[PDB]
Design a binder for these strands. Structure first.
Ligand SMILES: [Cl-]
Ligand SMILES: [Cl-]
Ligand SMILES: [Cl-]
Ligand SMILES: [Cl-]
Ligand SMILES: [Mn+2]
Ligand SMILES: [Mn+2]
Ligand SMILES: [Mn+2]
Ligand SMILES: [Mn+2]
Ligand SMILES: [Mn+2]
Lengths: 107, 98, 93, 84, 97, 78, 104, 92
DNA sequence: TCAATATCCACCTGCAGATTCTACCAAAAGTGTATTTGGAAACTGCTCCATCAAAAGGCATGTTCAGCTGAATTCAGCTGAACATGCCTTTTGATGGAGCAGTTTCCAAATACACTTTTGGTAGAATCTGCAGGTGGATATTGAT
DNA sequence: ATCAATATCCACCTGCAGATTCTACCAAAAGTGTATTTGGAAACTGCTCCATCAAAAGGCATGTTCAGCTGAATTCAGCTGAACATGCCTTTTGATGGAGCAGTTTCCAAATACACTTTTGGTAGAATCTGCAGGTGGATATTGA
């Protein structure tokens, strides 16, 4: 019987095995169910797809083909949900969203 | 001689720095401040440059955010000039004090 | 001295959404920190969720309910769909 | 080595002005510069104190980027970009 | 006919309430509100009495705190009258917005 | 139901907060903040309820929700 | 002949040890860790009670209620900092009125 | 079922104030307090060990955790009682 | 200051809701053994951190100068406090009933384990290339007349 | 409404610092055959969590008056921005020496595993008790005159 990676059995790109190990070695609980590493690898994969999709667009917009930190920032900060999720996270080299309070502009 | 009115270069600078992401404090002086504070904490210490860079990224991300809030307290007091009392209110409300 | 990373998978997923795009290494490590971070937040909540219900085993159900707690739907609602999906596909051996 | 003193002044008026700009600030009072150095020093001392604690616990003499990342996480200021 | 000047009874009230610890929201309306919100998440729910009490405690402590910060924002703007603009600013600096 | 939370009740809270003068618009602003607060807390609580397969929100379900929001409450099981 | 009495403590060294193992904190738990942790817990408990007791006394009370615990915490900088994100149910707040709001 | 530190707190109460009592709510509050700090210190201790790839939480991890978690003088005294209790214990 | 409201503030006082005090059984806690093994100690291979040197210019310093912003004043419209009425909704106090947490009692599905092959990844060489930095007209954007 | 003065754009270029690929192991997933549990599933309680009932009691909802707070409108000393001239000291490059991480091994002191043996901690009545909640009677604190 040929080797069938669990990632493939699950239909995922992320490493189901690895995740299954990080779980048993993380002192999170006595034992870990079989589904557990699969559901987590999926969520972790859904989310990184979500930010890369927006990061890639911020890149395209700024006329670059390679995603850099600043693109991750614009992607995260311009998205209410991703922003709330990473509300207390500082992205190195990400800078800030260009934003100037109205009262400050020439009258 | 041509001369921009007070406030115009300031707005130019906001647009300019909100666009960029480079560190705004100079490298060497900051590395020193780190070594000076650390040393007056525990002697014979060493740092990976990486470690000093992580501290600079965080301090700048922190001061920049504190200034966004400071600026809102200024505006709120119907002013356009930030003052110490503004930094103090933002820190008080943020829980960095009471 | 070999050290594990998520880079390989992050890159694969990157090629899927934007085949034309690449990613600087700072951006990649950032992405790495993001993955290990949410993994930590999910697992931990899973860990506690298991304790409250006197269980010594973290099932896909703990992960699910944890996901519902840490993420803001929509993000939540879509993450839960993918997890359910991946699991049943898995149980189909 | 050489004695380290007053290095908090290595945080110049122009560097603070720049930080205020990125924070979107337009006009700065003369007293902001010293309040900022005061505020920065407290911030840095706390992060370094915790970071050096993780270092000593690891029986090292070198503060690594991870010590800093962990210190920052304790303070609830998670940093991305140095985890390796 | 006797009458205290505006604000004098306000100070009297501050001292009274900063001195006690009794809940300040009427127990019944609160409970009604708590279940209304909960029904929107899961229908037909039961609530341990203490569960509803824990919620009112946290809820009132949260508001009292927010009013402290709000009052500071009002003072910062040379006023003595709290306004939504004050609650909004405090919630922003707090990270709730 | 939010109107159940009455003006006098809000004045009292403000008073404990140390507020002397209250603008006429603070009452409606307060009800809104209070409902968002409750929605968030209960939503998490009820999630804890469902996980435990119950039909009853327990004080511990609330205590754990509060900790998730960073509003740790003492005196109800934690 | 309990480890607690042996370490000179009132806190359940044995239980702290069981609670450390059953807590999924680590594969193995050192012999002294529960002693230490138990000591730390007792000390902070004595600290609060010690101040809470004083708060009651001054209120002309012999029984420590929640308000007393609140007065002891919020009036001590260290304890306040430690319990900065904690609300004591039925504890109320410290009486403090902003200067500006005072008469005249 | 349902064990608490309730009893151990009352003993401590009697050492500092033999004279003083304590309400029901006050007792549960002190109970939530003990479990809370217990959880913070243990958790920080858990991570500290994983950073050094150790499998056991020793009193060294408990102490650093304390140093990281307790502020200023509280941490100092906590640390003193700590190593002291480990001494009057390893003595027999 | 004088006087007249209402407010606070001790001193005592009498029970009722909790507390503290008792009288008992299991389930942790302490034990006597018998094993596992984690990680402190002992090297030592070698990245990396602290230093040194030298040159170059990006930038921090200081000083001038005066635009226009923050701080002081004034003044009065009307919002928000103080109150006496009048009345409705919250209290609260058992009763009774019933949904249902909490406990038991099984155990079949699901995991932890112990080995044994097979890859999927990670660590560098070997290759590739976005884009950082420079230049220059094309276009505003400002600010004086 | 003009335009000089300057700053902001944007496309056009080209090596090379920083990605991407190409290769090789080898640490750890996948494959299977056993030795344990666990987490659910029924069955039953005894809890406590609704539902009513039903008075009384505050506590909330109105409408009145007007005190005094928040703005709007005006001024003006001078604080803080924009520019310039100077020349310091942070940057950049390169190259070492060796401090001190990291990677391996070695193996006892220390922690885990039973199998028991006691003792202590949680329960649910029994035996007191600290303060609440009133009740005056006495100086205060406010506020009008
Ligand atoms: Cl599972
Ligand atoms: Cl100021
Ligand atoms: Cl407003
Ligand atoms: Cl130990
Ligand atoms: Mn100079
Ligand atoms: Mn102005
Ligand atoms: Mn008038
Ligand atoms: Mn292969
Ligand atoms: Mn006993």
């Amino acid at each position: 019987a040929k080797a069938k990676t669990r990632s493939s059995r699950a239909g995922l790109q992320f490493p189901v095995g690895r995740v299954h190990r990080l779980l048993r070695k993380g002192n999170y609980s006595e034992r870990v169910g079989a589904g557990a590493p699969v559901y987590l690898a999926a969520v972790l994969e859904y989310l990184t797809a979500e930010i890369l999709e927006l990061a890639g667009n911020a890149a395209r917009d700024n006329k670059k083909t390679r995603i850099i930190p600043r693109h991750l920032q614009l992607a995260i900060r311009n998205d209410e949900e991703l922003n709330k999720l990473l509300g207390r996270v500082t992205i190195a080299q990400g800078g800030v969203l260009p934003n100037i309070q109205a009262v400050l502009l020439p009258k | 001689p041509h001369r921009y009115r007070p406030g115009t270069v300031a707005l130019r600078e906001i647009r300019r720095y909100q666009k960029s992401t480079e560190l705004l404090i100079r490298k060497l002086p900051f590395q020193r401040l780190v070594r000076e504070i650390a040393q007056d904490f525990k002697t014979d210490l060493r740092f990976q440059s990486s470690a000093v860079m992580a501290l600079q990224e965080a301090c700048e991300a922190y001061l920049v955010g504190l200034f966004e809030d400071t600026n809102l307290c200024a505006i709120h007091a119907k002013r356009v000039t930030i003052m110490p009392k503004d930094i103090q209110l933002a820190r008080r409300i943020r829980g960095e004090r009471a | 001295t070999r050290k594990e990373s998520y880079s390989i998978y992050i890159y694969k997923v990157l090629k899927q959404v934007h085949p034309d795009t690449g990613i600087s290494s700072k951006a990649m490590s950032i992405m790495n920190s993001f993955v290990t971070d949410i993994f930590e937040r999910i697992a931990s909540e899973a860990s506690r969720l298991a304790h409250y219900s006197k269980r010594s085993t973290i099932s896909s159900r703990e992960i699910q309910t944890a996901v519902r707690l840490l993420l803001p739907g929509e993000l939540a609602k879509h993450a839960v769909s993918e997890g359910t999906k991946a699991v049943t596909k898995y149980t189909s051996s | 080595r050489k004695v380290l003193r007053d290095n908090i002044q290595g945080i110049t008026k122009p560097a603070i002005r720049r930080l205020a700009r990125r924070g979107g600030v337009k006009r700065i009072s003369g007293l902001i510069y010293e309040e900022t150095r005061g505020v920065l020093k407290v911030f840095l001392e706390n992060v370094i104190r915790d970071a050096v604690t993780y270092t000593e616990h690891a029986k090292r003499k070198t503060v690594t980027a991870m010590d800093v990342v962990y210190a920052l996480k304790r303070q609830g200021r998670t940093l991305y970009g140095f985890g390796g």
